[PDB]
């Protein structure tokens, strides 16, 4: 039983604190893969990890330590989009495969730029057909966008621009910010923008909605579309960078719509690990120190679990693992081919790897009502199926317009 090492980065804080649940999910998967005689009988999968803090600057220090210190690692496993973009761009220099469990950046689908990269997390492009379906449902042809300038968001908006153009919908106003959304939000108010797509991490979302409160860019005529990956009480958290109180934030966020991806199989079937989606959740909850609602990365945890299985199966097919070096393409090419041909059933459903989208068909749509998220529907872009709960609520009983229509 030779040792085989994974160099992994887990974000315990920062933009997306996904490591909080994904690190225990990875440890659960490694135990299961190791205690399986039929998978890698002649090898033991070992984890060497660090807290990236969802920060490329801090990940750069840990990437150095992983690469320039023994033992040699056969694969790198980053979480966040910014960290995965940095390690996937750099990895070719060390002929290393990069497997992300958490990176949604659409730009990561670029095989020329990221030639050794795989991910179990779907591309963020999956939110865009759902946003378009809802714009059509609610009859909107004029949308505004506001994004924080991390490439995950900018590349999502590049994809949205293509999808809206195809549907005969226009982005009539765009604003971007690196850290301070004060000017973008003031400009959205002055332009009389109504339907707004806002792409940013939870930390920046608080800064945005404090400016939204101040500018009165909320109420009956405004509809905000956000990413559904934030903590359920995100707008209620004390934040020294914002002057707005909890009650002011709560009223600014009222009625907004969110989209997220369904990452856990909703059917009660048993996957390759012989677990059902429901037992995986109880098992992960058994490992956690805080409740699921209090742990970052809980919804993404099945992807972390399945990434270890995907790697274990790919290593099994290639079988000479102790002989991997950073100067040799041979073993890299073989594991790349095994990963490329992956096809198994995981806790997140049918696991396959093809660059552009990253598989699975469903998004979950929620609306914030009275300070709490309520499920309002699901959308499957492959079969064009919008499953609607009829639980959405609007001031006056119906959504607003995308603009005034009465100036003859």
């Amino acid at each position: 039983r030779r040792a085989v090492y994974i160099g992994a980065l887990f974000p315990m804080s920062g933009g997306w604190p996904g490591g909080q649940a994904c690190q225990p999910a990875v440890e659960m998967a490694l135990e299961d893969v190791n205690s399986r005689r039929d998978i890698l009988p002649d090898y033991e999968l070992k984890l060497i990890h660090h807290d990236s803090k969802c920060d490329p600057g801090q990940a750069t220090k840990y990437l150095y330590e992983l690469l320039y210190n023994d033992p040699i690692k056969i694969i790198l496993m980053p979480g966040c989009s910014s960290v995965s973009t940095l390690v996937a761009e750099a990895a070719r220099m060390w002929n290393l495969i990069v497997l992300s469990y958490g990176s949604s950046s659409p730009a990561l689908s670029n095989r020329q730029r990221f030639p050794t990269f795989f991910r179990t997390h779907p591309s963020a492009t999956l939110h865009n057909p759902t946003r378009v379906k809802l714009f059509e449902k609610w009859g909107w042809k004029k949308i505004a966008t506001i994004q924080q300038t991390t490439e995950v968001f900018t590349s999502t908006l590049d994809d949205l621009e293509e999808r809206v153009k195809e549907a005969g919908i226009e982005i009539t106003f765009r604003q971007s910010f690196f850290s301070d959304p004060a000017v973008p939000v003031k400009n959205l108010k002055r332009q009389d923008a109504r339907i707004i797509v806002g792409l940013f991490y939870e930390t920046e979302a608080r800064k945005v909605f404090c400016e939204v409160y101040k500018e009165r860019l909320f109420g009956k005529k405004y509809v905000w579309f956000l990413i559904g990956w934030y903590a359920d009480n995100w707008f209620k958290i004390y934040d020294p960078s914002i002057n707005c109180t909890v009650d002011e934030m709560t009223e600014a966020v009222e009625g907004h719509i969110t989209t997220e991806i369904v990452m856990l199989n909703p059917a009660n079937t048993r996957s390759i690990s012989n677990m059902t989606s429901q037992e995986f959740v109880e098992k992960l909850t058994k490992r956690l120190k805080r409740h699921p609602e209090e742990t970052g990365g809980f919804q993404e945890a099945p992807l972390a679990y399945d990434a270890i299985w995907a790697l274990a199966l790919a290593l099994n097919k290639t079988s000479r693992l102790e002989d991997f070096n950073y100067n040799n393409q041979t073993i890299t090419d073989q594991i790349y081919r095994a990963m490329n041909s992956s096809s198994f059933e995981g806790v997140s459903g049918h696991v396959v790897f093809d660059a552009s989208g990253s598989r699975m068909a469903w998004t979950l749509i929620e609306q914030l009502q009275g300070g709490s998220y309520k499920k309002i529907g699901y959308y499957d872009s492959t079969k064009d199926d919008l499953s609607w709960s009829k639980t959405d609520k609007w001031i006056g009983g119906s959504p607003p317009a995308d603009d005034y229509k009465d100036d003859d």
């Binding site: 490329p56 600057g57 750069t60 765009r174 604003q175 971007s176 973008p184």
Partner: protein, 408 residues
Amino acid sequence: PPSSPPLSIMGLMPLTKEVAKGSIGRGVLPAVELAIEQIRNESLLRPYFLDLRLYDTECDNAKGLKAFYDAIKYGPNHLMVFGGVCPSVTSIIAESLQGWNLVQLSFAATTPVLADKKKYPYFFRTVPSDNAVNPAILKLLKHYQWKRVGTLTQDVQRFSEVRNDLTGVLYGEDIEISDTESFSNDPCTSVKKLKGNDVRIILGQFDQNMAAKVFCCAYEENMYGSKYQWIIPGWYEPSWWECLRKNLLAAMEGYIGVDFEPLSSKQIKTISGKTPQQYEREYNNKRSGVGPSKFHGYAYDGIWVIAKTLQRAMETLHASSRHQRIQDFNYTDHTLGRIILNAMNETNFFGVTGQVVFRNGERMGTIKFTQFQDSREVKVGEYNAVADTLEIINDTIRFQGSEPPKDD
């Protein structure tokens, strides 16, 4: 001298003939050599010598990161980083500096987000950044009594950040931004909106490729001539323009470009005892198999910044302990990084690019105004940030009308 100890510096820049921006690195090396030559002849750092090691970034994220990592693993104990030319490479290095307690000085990276001291605390630059144009434009607007402006911004981080910075510069000043317009790939819709709002003075922030599209839309909309003033970035390649060419030229006539000033216009003796004019001639005499680089003066002054910082880092009556701490440096000493950071923060001398002083790691320098006049960019003015003064060159700047355009 064999007994003279080295003060090692990690030089990072593109040098190879394989990459286009290799010409920048190769172009500044005669300026660097002249500064090093004089500093040694003067033995300003006695008994030490400045040991600049060069590492090729090849203007590539992956090669740049590996060049940095390899310099750490295999090179001498570098005290600071000198360089970073290509913005994406510079950002990767600059955000990670704290991991190795390294202060960085760039002579060519101008993108605005590098001014963020939360993300890049250990980063300094001798070159005025893209945001440095905004206080200069304010003085130009006051000079011609332009109180109402429109803005046209490409929805990309380096441009939206300059535009967001503009609001803060104009605040408390009596200048209205009557219309803010942004575009991703087609400025024509935004140009049409500016025309519709009767904007006369336009502040543009967009790349070289988009500029030709912008002026083609201005031509189609008749947004040029005696009634209009376009003020755009001045850092485009010379003859970037070379719509039919004649129509493009009619719309471009009289546009004002804003960029940093390559060398000081003052005939005063700098820290080297040479005037900027005498330095310029010695630079052209020293360079042999390379074209000139517009950043050569910034690189020359950059070496003087490093030498003065090192001299200050050694100014203590705890001499033997300070010399021992310098000898012992192996990237882990937070105290030495702090000593160097504080010393660089105190920089204040007259360089070939004018008074060299920093404000939160950003250069307080000189901004040059140009005006497009018949397929030639004519220098028309200079703005000095320390004095906050604008000097318009007599008999250069011209207006198509009998008077400069009115803002309404």
